[PDB]
Each structure stands twice: as C-alpha cells, then as structure tokens.
Amino acid sequence: KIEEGKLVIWINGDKGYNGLAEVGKKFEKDTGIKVTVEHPDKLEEKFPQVAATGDGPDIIFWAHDRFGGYAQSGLLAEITPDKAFQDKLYPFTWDAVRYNGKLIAYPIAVEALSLIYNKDLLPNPPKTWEEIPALDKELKAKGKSALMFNLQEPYFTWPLIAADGGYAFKYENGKYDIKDVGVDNAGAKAGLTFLVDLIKNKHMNADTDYSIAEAAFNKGETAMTINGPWAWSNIDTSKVNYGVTVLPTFKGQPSKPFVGVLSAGINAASPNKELAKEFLENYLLTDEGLEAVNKDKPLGAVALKSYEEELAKDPRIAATMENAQKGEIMPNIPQMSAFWYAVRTAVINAASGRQTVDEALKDAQTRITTYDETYKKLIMSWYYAGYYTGLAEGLAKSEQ
Amino acid sequence: KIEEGKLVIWINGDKGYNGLAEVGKKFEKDTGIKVTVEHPDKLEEKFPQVAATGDGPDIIFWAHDRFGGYAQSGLLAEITPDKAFQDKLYPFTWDAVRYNGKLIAYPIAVEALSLIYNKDLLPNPPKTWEEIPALDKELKAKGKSALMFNLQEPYFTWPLIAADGGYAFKYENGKYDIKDVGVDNAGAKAGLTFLVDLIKNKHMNADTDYSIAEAAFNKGETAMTINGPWAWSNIDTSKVNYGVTVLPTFKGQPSKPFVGVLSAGINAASPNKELAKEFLENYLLTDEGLEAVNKDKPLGAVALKSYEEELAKDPRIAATMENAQKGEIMPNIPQMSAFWYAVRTAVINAASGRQTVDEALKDAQTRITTYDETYKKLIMSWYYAGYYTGLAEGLAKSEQR
Numbered sequence: 001k002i003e004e005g006k007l008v009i010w011i012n013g014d015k016g017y018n019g020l021a022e023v024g025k026k027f028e029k030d031t032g033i034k035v036t037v038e039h040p041d042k043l044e045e046k047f048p049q050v051a052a053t054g055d056g057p058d059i060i061f062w063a064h065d066r067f068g069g070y071a072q073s074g075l076l077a078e079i080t081p082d083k084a085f086q087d088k089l090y091p092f093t094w095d096a097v098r099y100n101g102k103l104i105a106y107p108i109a110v111e112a113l114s115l116i117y118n119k120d121l122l123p124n125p126p127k128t129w130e131e132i133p134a135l136d137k138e139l140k141a142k143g144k145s146a147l148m149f150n151l152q153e154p155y156f157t158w159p160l161i162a163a164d165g166g167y168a169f170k171y172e173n174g175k176y177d178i179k180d181v182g183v184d185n186a187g188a189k190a191g192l193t194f195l196v197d198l199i200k201n202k203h204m205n206a207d208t209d210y211s212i213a214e215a216a217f218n219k220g221e222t223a224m225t226i227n228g229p230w231a232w233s234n235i236d237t238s239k240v241n242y243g244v245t246v247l248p249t250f251k252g253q254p255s256k257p258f259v260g261v262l263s264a265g266i267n268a269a270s271p272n273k274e275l276a277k278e279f280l281e282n283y284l285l286t287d288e289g290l291e292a293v294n295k296d297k298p299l300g301a302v303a304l305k306s307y308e309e310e311l312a313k314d315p316r317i318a319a320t321m322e323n324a325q326k327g328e329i330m331p332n333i334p335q336m337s338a339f340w341y342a343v344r345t346a347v348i349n350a351a352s353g354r355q356t357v358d359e360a361l362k363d364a365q366t367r368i369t370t371y372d373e374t375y376k377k378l379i380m381s382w383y384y385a386g387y388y389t390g391l392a393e394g395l396a397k398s399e400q
Numbered sequence: 401k402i403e404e405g406k407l408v409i410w411i412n413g414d415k416g417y418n419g420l421a422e423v424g425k426k427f428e429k430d431t432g433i434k435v436t437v438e439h440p441d442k443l444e445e446k447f448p449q450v451a452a453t454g455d456g457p458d459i460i461f462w463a464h465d466r467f468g469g470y471a472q473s474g475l476l477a478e479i480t481p482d483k484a485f486q487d488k489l490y491p492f493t494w495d496a497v498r499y500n501g502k503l504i505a506y507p508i509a510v511e512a513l514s515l516i517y518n519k520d521l522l523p524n525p526p527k528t529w530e531e532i533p534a535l536d537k538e539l540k541a542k543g544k545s546a547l548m549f550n551l552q553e554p555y556f557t558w559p560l561i562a563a564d565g566g567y568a569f570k571y572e573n574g575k576y577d578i579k580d581v582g583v584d585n586a587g588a589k590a591g592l593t594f595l596v597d598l599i600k601n602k603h604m605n606a607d608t609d610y611s612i613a614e615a616a617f618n619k620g621e622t623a624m625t626i627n628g629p630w631a632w633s634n635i636d637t638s639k640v641n642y643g644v645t646v647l648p649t650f651k652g653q654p655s656k657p658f659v660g661v662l663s664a665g666i667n668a669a670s671p672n673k674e675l676a677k678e679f680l681e682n683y684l685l686t687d688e689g690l691e692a693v694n695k696d697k698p699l700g701a702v703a704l705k706s707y708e709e710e711l712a713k714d715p716r717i718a719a720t721m722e723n724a725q726k727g728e729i730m731p732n733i734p735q736m737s738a739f740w741y742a743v744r745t746a747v748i749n750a751a752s753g754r755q756t757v758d759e760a761l762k763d764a765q766t767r768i769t770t771y772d773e774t775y776k777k778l779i780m781s782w783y784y785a786g787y788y789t790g791l792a793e794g795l796a797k798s799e800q801r
C-alpha cells in the first residue's frame with residue numbers, strides 16, 4: 001500500500017533532489033499534503049521491482065527511455081494534462097513520453113552530454129577525437145591527462161559508437177524495428193575500436209567510473225570530461241575555469257549523444273494520482289518550480305518553454321542543445337532496457353580486453369535482436385545473480 | 401590444443417596436479433603418449449563454454465555434481481569400463497557418475513569437508529556451532545580468532561545451512577524433484593542467520609576467502625578452519641599441530657556437508673578416448689597412480705577399494721568419511737549448476753549485508769525453481785552479462801577507494 005494523502009517521489013541522486021524537496025515544501029504549505037523526496041541507488045531497476053507488487057513512490061523521475069518498458073508492464077498511470085497545459089511544453093518532449101498513443105509521464109528537462117574542458121589547461125578544446133591521443137601525450141609530460149569520463153555506463157560511450165554509423169533500432173515509417181539493430185555495423189565497430197585503442201595506449205583506463213572521472217576533472221588532473229548539466233554544480237564548487245562545448249567529431253562526423261527527456265511518471269498503483277498531477281502541473285512545471293530544482297543541480301535545457309527561453313541565454317545550455325540536435329532522441333520502447341544492458345556488457349568486455357571489439361558487439365547484437373519480453377523476469381533474475389557475484393569479486397581486494 | 405595422439409587434462413589448482421603429471425610422465429614412458437596437466441581458473445565454468453567448439457581438454461576432473469549438466473548438453477563421452485573394473489570401485493561412487501542410465505565419468509575420490517583445528521590453541525575441538533562465538537571472544541583476548549573459512553564459495557557454508565533442514569532438491573524415490581527446492585525453508589534460514597550473526601558480531605569477516613583462511617590457519621592465527629583433504633599438505637608444511645574431526649552440530653543436529661565424488665570425464669570432442677580410458681583405468685586408478693596424486697595433495701577417501709582400505713586407517717580419512725556419512729551425496733542433475741550459482745549469490749549478499757537472509761534465500765529459491773535446462777544458453781548468456789558488468793563495476797569502485 002502506497003499511503004493515501006501524501007506524495008513520495010524518487011529521483012536520481014545526481015539531480016537536484018533538495019531543490020525538488022523545496023517545491024514539495026511549498027506544495028505542503030499551500031495544500032497540507034506532505035511530499036517526501038528520496039534518491040535510492042539504482043532506482044530505475046528498483047522501481048519496476050517494488051511497483052510490480054503495488055508499492056514504491058507516487059512519482060518516479062527518470063529519462064524517458066525506461067518509461068515505455070514501465071508502461072508496458074502496467075506500472076504507469078496515463079496522465080491527463082489539458083491542452084492548455086500541454087501548450088506550455090515543447091511538442092517533441094510530449095512525443096518522447098507518448099507510448100502506444102497515451103501520454104505516460106510529464107517531461108521536465110532535455111538532457112544531452114557535452115564536452116567539458118578546463119580552459120586553463122587547454123585553452124582551445126580539440127575538435128576531433130583523433131587528436132586526443134597526441135594531446136594526452138603532451139599533457140602526460142606535465143603530469144596531467146587529456147580526457148577522463150565514465151567507462152562503466154554506455155550512455156557516455158554511445159556518442160562515439162554512433163558517430164560513424166552505430167544505431168540502436170532502425171526507425172522507419174514512424175516505427176522502430178525491434179529486429180533491425182545497429183550495434184554491430186561498421187560504424188559501431190570503428191567507434192568502439194577507437195575507444196579501445198585509447199585504453200590500449202594508456203590514454204584512458206578501463207577502471208574509470210563516474211566518481212573517478214568527476215574527481216580527476218574537478219581536481220584539475222585531467223583537461224576534459226564528458227558529462228551532463230547535473231555535473232556542473234560540483235565543477236562550480238571546484239572553481240576549475242571550465243567551458244561546455246560540442247563533442248569532438250569522429251571520422252569527420254559529429255558525436256551523436258542519445259538525448260534523454262528527464263520525465264516524471266505517476267505510479268499506476270498510487271491512490272494519489274490527482275495530487276500528483278497537481279504537484280507536477282501547478283508547482284513543479286512552473287518557472288519558479290523548475291528554478292528551485294535548477295538552483296540545486298542544473299537541469300540543463302528544460303521542456304517548459306517560458307523557462308527554457310531564460311535558460312538558453314546561458315551558452316552552456318545552448319551548447320547542451322547544440323549536442324542534443326546532433327544526436328537522436330532515445331526510443332522509449334520496452335526493448336531499450338535489453339539494448340542498454342547488452343551495450344554496457346559489450347563496452348566493458350572490449351575495454352577490459354576480455355573480448356575483441358568484433359566479438360563484443362556481435363554478442364550484443366544477438367542479445368538484443370533475439371531478446372523476447374516474454375522472458376524478461378527470467379533473464380533479469382539471472383543477470384542479477386551474475387551481477388552480485390561479479391560485484392563481490394571486483395570489490396574483494398578492496399576489503400581483502 | 402587437443403591434438404590427436406596426446407592427452408590434455410584439466411584439474412583444479414587446489415588438487416595434486418603435480419602428482420597427476422608424474423602419473424602422466426609414467427604413461428608417456430610406457431606408451432610414448434605425452435600427457436599435459438593444466439589447472440585453468442574457473443575450469444568448471446570454462447568447460448561447458450568451450451568443449452563443444454574446438455574444446456577444451458581430453459579429460460576434465462571435477463566433482464560429479466557438474467557432470468549431469470555437461471552430459472545432458474552432449475559434452476561428455478559414455479565411458480566403457482567392464483564389470484570387472486567397476487567392481488574395483490565402491491558402488492555409490494558409480495551411482496554419482498551415472499546419468500540417465502549411462503556412466504559418464506570415472507570416480508576418483510570421495511570429498512567431504514571436515515573441521516580442522518589447531519590442538520595448541522584448542523586441545524579439544526567444539527562439537528557445536530553455538531559455542532563458537534564464546535570461543536572467539538576468548539581467542540580474541542589471546543590475539544587470535546576461533547574460526548576462519550572461505551565465505552565466498554557456498555560449498556563451505558552449505559553444511560551449516562543444511563544442518564537444521566535446508567536442502568537442494570527433494571529426493572523421492574529415487575528421483576530428485578526439480579520443483580521442490582529447500583533453500584528458503586526455516587532450517588536453511590536458521591543456518592544462514594547463524595552465519596550472518598557471526599559476521600555481525602565480528603567473529604568472522606564477510607570478505608574472508610580461501611587463501612585468507614588458509615594463511616590464517618597455517619600461520620597459527622585462527623584456531624579452526626573448514627576445508628577438504630587437499631588442504632592437509634600445506635598444513636603439514638606449516639607444522640601447526642592440527643586435527644581433523646567431525647563438523648560442529650547446530651541445534652544438536654549434525655552439519656550436513658554436500659559430498660562430491662572428484663571424477664574424470666572424457667570430453668566427447670576428444671579424438672583420444674581410447675588413450676584416455678587406458679590412462680584412467682590402467683595408470684591412474686591403481687594404488688601406485690593414486691598414491692602419486694595423494695603424495696602431492698591428499699585426495700582424502702578414494703573410490704578405488706584397494707587403496708581406500710589402506711587410507712581408511714588414517715584418522716583424518718575416518719573423519720572425512722564420518723562427515724560424508726552425516727552429509728549427502730550431491731545430485732548430478734543438470735539443475736545443480738543453477739543451484740550453486742543462486743546459492744553463491746545468496747550467501748554473498750546476506751554475508752555482506754546487501755540483502756537480508758529472508759530476501760537473499762527467497763531470490764535463490766525463485767532462481768532455482770524458474771531455471772529451465774532447455775533455456776540454459778539464454779539464461780547463462782545473461783548471467784555472464786551480469787557477472788562481467790558487476791566485476792567491472794567492483795574493480796572501478798576498488799580503484800576509487
């Protein structure tokens with residue numbers, strides 16, 4: 001039983017959860033309804049687990065790519081904004097949260113990765129990926145490095161895999177073809193090979209995660225990182241003098257970040273759907289609501305036109321859109337979950353040297369094209385049996 | 401590296417692989433066939449991945465519990481010892497390697513864990529798990545600890561989980577029921593809760609593994625360990641003065657270790673099956689072949705009657721068979737691999753506090769009862785996607801720290 005008469009919200013711990021809680025305090029002040037904001041680890045995996053049993057938050061925030069899966073599983077209420085409200089957000093953001101003809105979440109922000117660089121170490125950022133190895137050689141001679149970014153999560157490596165031709169599912173005639181997958185074509189291989197060579201030549205290390213890359217950039221140890229607007233707040237605190245710019249090209253072609261619309265879905269099992277709609281439409285999705293969240297951790301570009309026109313005066317937000325426009329909106333289909341788990345494993349195995357690039361991407365292509373949602377529960381249960389065993393083994397020397 | 405006219409053998413690196421290579425040298429001296437003994441890591445996971453392609457070893461040594469899965473997948477040759485040869489080994493050993501009516505490996509040794517204890521630190525060993533926290537409190541004040549053993553491998557914790565009523569698959573009769581799994585009943589929970597409490601109360605550390613427990617016992621730092629007979633020769637080298645005895649009781653009931661029959665299977669893709677039969681029947685399964693292996697690392701109780709009658713005189717082998725009698729022979733059915741992968745994750749997550757005992761054993765029970773051997777390749781493809789992802793994540797987090 002989710003409890004009637006209050007709202008519980010889950011949102012990722014990289015986002016402005018404290019600013020969201022301030023909107024929640026204002027909602028309580030006007031309405032009497034208490035709002036509790038939590039940021040559980042792995043909430044995008046935890047949500048469908050607790051919500052399947054009718055528990056969990058009233059409202060879940062995540063990028064839109066997970067929501068078609070959640071909707072398919074019956075976890076998300078259809079939302080009911082009137083046309084006047086829908087006119088306040090850009091049309092392409094509503095398209096990202098439309099699944100089988102129904103709106104299933106409220107769009108909040110438009111997220112894309114950018115290249116973030118330290119202006120003191122590197123006054124003119126490289127326009128190409130190909131120039132990064134020579135730059136790293138130069139910087140290593142000064143005890144610095146050229147680039148560090150999260151290698152554990154395929155969101156960050158995808159822009160390079162997609163630049164020369166990689167794609168998730170082929171889009172044609174307004175539909176994604178779940179059986180036409182582009183993770184193992186010549187462009188995907190060229191980009192992942194380029195990444196793997198950076199690692200073979202010691203310009204990057206496979207054991208790099210978000211926290212490692214964030215610390216190296218914010219301590220002035222590495223000249224560049226790849227990250228979204230939520231990261232800007234810790235950089236601002238570090239006082240590194242940084243710029244936010246277009247991602248390097250690869251083979252003369254733009255990097256193509258997958259663009260996520262951070263969105264708020266309402267749990268199908270919540271008895272508080274009308275209060276959740278009120279909080280989202282009349283408190284959060286206002287200039288003052290989004291500003292409260294943004295002042296905590298930047299949202300980047302936002303779906304609300306009136307506030308996006310103010311935010312876009314900042315060239316960091318314009319650069320975020322410049323990168324977004326060069327990439328592709330994520331599909332929200334339920335097969336996105338298999339896509340990301342398969343690509344995450346492929347990047348990991350090629351980066352560690354466990355598999356060659358061609359072996360890794362061939363295995364990911366089969367895993368995705370032969371995936372069948374009928375077996376989702378079985379497949380996920382055994383993935384996690386493997387994940388907790390491998391995590392304990394990876395953490396071991398670290399205890400003993 | 402399987403080539404016609406030589407033999408490649410895989411055996412685990414804790415066993416007497418150097419001793420086995422001396423048997424291989426004798427075979428090469430008599431027959432001119434070269435024998436190469438290797439001990440790859442994770443060989444029991446590697447074999448089912450590579451045997452069906454260009455393999456793989458000619459002969460694989462492992463406890464019998466993995467071999468039903470290999471045989472069901474077509475990976476092992478039917479072996480053809482005549483009746484006179486079979487009569488030289490104990491019948492219950494041939495039952496452990498019989499799968500759907502066919503013999504699929506040669507039994508070698510009967511393995512059961514025992515309590516190993518340092519007589520200088522504990523002259524009389526405990527017969528209860530319940531006393532171990534009190535013995536640890538006294539030993540901590542002497543700069544030592546009571547018990548250390550490998551907590552990463554569920555083989556070592558299973559005797560305690562099974563003591564009060566945990567079981568893998570209900571036997572009846574004489575069929576294992578794959579739908580009737582006993583990892584999440586009150587007895588399984590009571591055993592695993594006792595282990596988790598030992599860790600919560602700082603009598604053991606969740607991260608202790610084989611080499612940490614072995615170094616502690618053999619350097620005289622901890623009074624007890626739980627291990628099999630292959631461990632005894634490193635202790636002999638240490639001159640800790642040790643004994644080998646019955647595992648402690650829990651709620652007055654015996655610990656029930658799962659008994660493995662270390663067995664030698666012949667790869668179905670071997671073009672040397674006649675040579676492997678000659679090596680195994682005429683060189684290894686003789687007093688002189690088993691003695692050579694045992695002199696390197698003890699096999700424990702052996703399946704070959706002539707040699708076991710001589711070994712049974714050693715009180716360490718009597719303790720091994722006493723523990724084996726109180727425990728159960730593992731099933732060899734294909735679903736045993738699914739059992740161990742699920743219980744490995746459950747013990748690891750409960751020990752480290754990532755899940756409660758109830759949640760950990762509930763997930764193992766679901767994983768085991770929903771596994772379907774027909775879908776093993778789909779299931780294992782995703783298990784390994786998870787394993788490599790979690791390994792990479794943990795290694796990155798170790799670098800952060």
Ligand SMILES: OC[C@H]1O[C@H](O[C@H]2[C@H](O)[C@@H](O)[C@@H](O)O[C@@H]2CO)[C@H](O)[C@@H](O)[C@@H]1O
Pocket residue numbers: 012014044062063064065066111153154155156230260262340
């Ligand atoms: O790495 C795969 C992962 O990518 C995206 O998740 C992003 C997310 O969109 C952001 O809002 C942010 O905080 O970082 C996450 C990357 O680690 C997909 O949305 C997600 O489904 C996918 O697993």
Ligand SMILES: OC[C@H]1O[C@H](O[C@H]2[C@H](O)[C@@H](O)[C@@H](O)O[C@@H]2CO)[C@H](O)[C@@H](O)[C@@H]1O
Pocket residue numbers: 412414444462463464465466511553554555556660662740
């Ligand atoms: O821990 C589960 C593991 O248990 C048994 O493996 C034992 C094995 O029988 C011994 O010969 C020795 O190698 O130690 C192993 C424990 O680390 C099962 O035989 C095996 O299938 C299972 O995964």
